[PDB]
Amino acid sequence: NLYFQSMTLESMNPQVKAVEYAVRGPIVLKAGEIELELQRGIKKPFTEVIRANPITFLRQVMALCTYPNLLDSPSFPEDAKKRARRILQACSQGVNCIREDVAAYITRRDGGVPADPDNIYLTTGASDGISTILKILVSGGGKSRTGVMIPIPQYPLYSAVISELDAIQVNYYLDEENCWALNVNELRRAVQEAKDHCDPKVLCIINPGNPTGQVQSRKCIEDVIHFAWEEKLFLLADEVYQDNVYSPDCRFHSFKKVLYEMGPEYSSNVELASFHSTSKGYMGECGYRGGYMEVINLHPEIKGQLVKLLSVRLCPPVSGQAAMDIVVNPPVAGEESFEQFSREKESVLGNLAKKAKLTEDLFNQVPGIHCNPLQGAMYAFPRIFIPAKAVEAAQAHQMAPDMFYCMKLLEETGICVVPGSGFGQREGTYHFRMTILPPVEKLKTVLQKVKDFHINFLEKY
Ligand SMILES: *Cc1c(COP(=O)(O)O)cnc(C)c1O
The missing domain is CATH 1.10.287.1970 (Helix Hairpins)
Incomplete structure (x- = not known):
């Protein structure tokens, strides 16, 4: 399934190799086939393959x-x-004064809840942090092997890391009928069912969500922390999209702020690692890849492994670190650039909010497609209602129903989206991932194409 694409020798001192593996499924192959058809002059109903990402x-x-x-x-x-x-x-945890800046940034974001620079670790992306934390947490064997709880639909990094570490994956289903909410009764079922065959010890939360584009309410974050405390779960709060919150009905509440507001009974005890990146959101920079994690209440056994792991790795490149420093030191009140910075942000966020409402509106006025509100991050995950017969067509082609649907959409419109089966979904449900990255007029054109294709699809199968 996974195929070698490239290798890079990052260093010899210490020696580190980076291997890229590509999944080359049906859509990837067809998109390539179509791109070559267009290059040798085949007339098509579209003039290009469009991805958006x-x-x-x-x-x-x-x-x-x-x-x-x-x-x-x-x-x-x-x-x-x-x-x-x-x-x-x-x-060692990263440059000192950058860690201080992150701490101070956390404190400002959290309305004065203090952050300690010594709990901050600079990383080469949030990916690196998540990998490192999961690696130091997985242990045991057979029925005592660490269980890691992850949402469905997935951000597929976590599944992949769980496999590399030979840990046990424990699925919990985001609640599609209430805006992809985390539902603690559901988390409780998943934990109880997993305890037969592993030791559930880690709970990964993605807020705002990817690919689901939801923003959790405070109360819900609070109920999850309480559940984590109750079940002795280490929390990973993957908050890379924290600046991209659009809905007027939503705001970003960090796990850090909520933990501390619940008081010391929780805030002295619950283990939390919160992640941030330089690559995501409207403050996102490219080229220079940085990140941090804030880790609180780390059990001493875990911290020992972290100290060692960091003694034998090179620091993250300082340009990534510098990039992170820039994003955690925006201008504040009374500074020369504060007012223009404030106007630029609001305008970018207003344009995303506009594209969000637009996307969800269009899908919700097209029969057989339903879209939850897009509250943050850059993706929607619309549900497609595929007839038991288009399902039969898909089956005949040896394909999952939404794979078949997405293949056909590509073949007819040139629009290349990722099927829900690439992320996981409730059995019997079908989706695809949409981006709001494109500008508004182009996005409008994509959504028209997706609408026409969708109506025709239903007519056909
Ligand atoms: C992209 C992404 C990551 C990884 O962030 P990098 O800083 O690019 O490593 C982690 N979690 C989510 C939800 C992401 O979208």
Whole structure:
């Protein structure tokens, strides 16, 4: 299923190799076949295959760090320069003053709930943090082997890491009939069923969600923390999309803030690792890959393994670290760039909110498609109601129903989306992942195509 695509020798001292593996399923192969058809002049109903997958201050600080001579330029505000200088001067858990900046950023975001720089670890993406935390937590054998609880629909990193570590995957189903909510009665069933054949010890929460685009309510975060406390579960709070919250009905509440607000009975006891990245959201930068995790209440046995693991790895590249520093040091009240930064953010978030409402509106006025509200992150996961007969057609082709549907959509419109079966879903349900990344007029055009295709599809099978 997985095939070797590339290798990179990252270093010899210490020696690290990075291997890329590609899954080359039916859609990937067909998209390639179609791209070559278009290249040798085959006339198609579309002219291209479409996949789909800004803040001045950040560009400015980045430009200053790339070319420090611009610290004497007047093309640049002084609050930018102040960031560049601190980063240039600073360049084991990560650079000290960057960890301080993250801590201070957490504190501001959480309305004054304190964060300690010594609980911060800089990583090469949230992926690296999640891998590292899961690796130090998995142990035991047979019926005592660590169970890791993960949502369905999945962000497929977690399944993959669980396999590499030979841990046991414990599925919990996000609640599609209540905006993809985490449902504790459901988590309780999943934990109770898994205890026969593993030791459930870890619970991974993705908020805002991917590919489901939901934002959890405070009460629900609170009920999950209580459940984790009760069952002695280590929580991983994957919060990489925390700045991309759109709905006026929703806000981002960190697991950190809620844990602390529940009081010391919880906040002294519950183990929590919260992740953040430089790659996601409207503050997202590319090229320079950074991240952090904030870890609280780490059991000493676990911390020992972390200290060792970090003694034998190289620090994350400092440019990733610098990138993270920029994202956790935006301008604050009374600084030169605060007002324009504030206007740029609001405009970007208003445009996403607009695309979100637009997408969900269109799907919900098309029969046989239903879309939960898109509250944050960049993806929707619409449910497709595939007739028992289009299901039969799909079966005849040896394909999952939504794979077949997504293949046909590609073949007719050139629109290339990922089927729900790439993420997992409740048995008997079918979805696909949609992005709101495209600009509004293009997004409108994609949604028209998806609508026409969808109506015809139902007519046909
Ligand atoms: C992309 C992503 C990650 C990994 O983040 P990087 O910083 O790119 O490693 C983790 N969790 C979710 C939900 C993601 O979308």
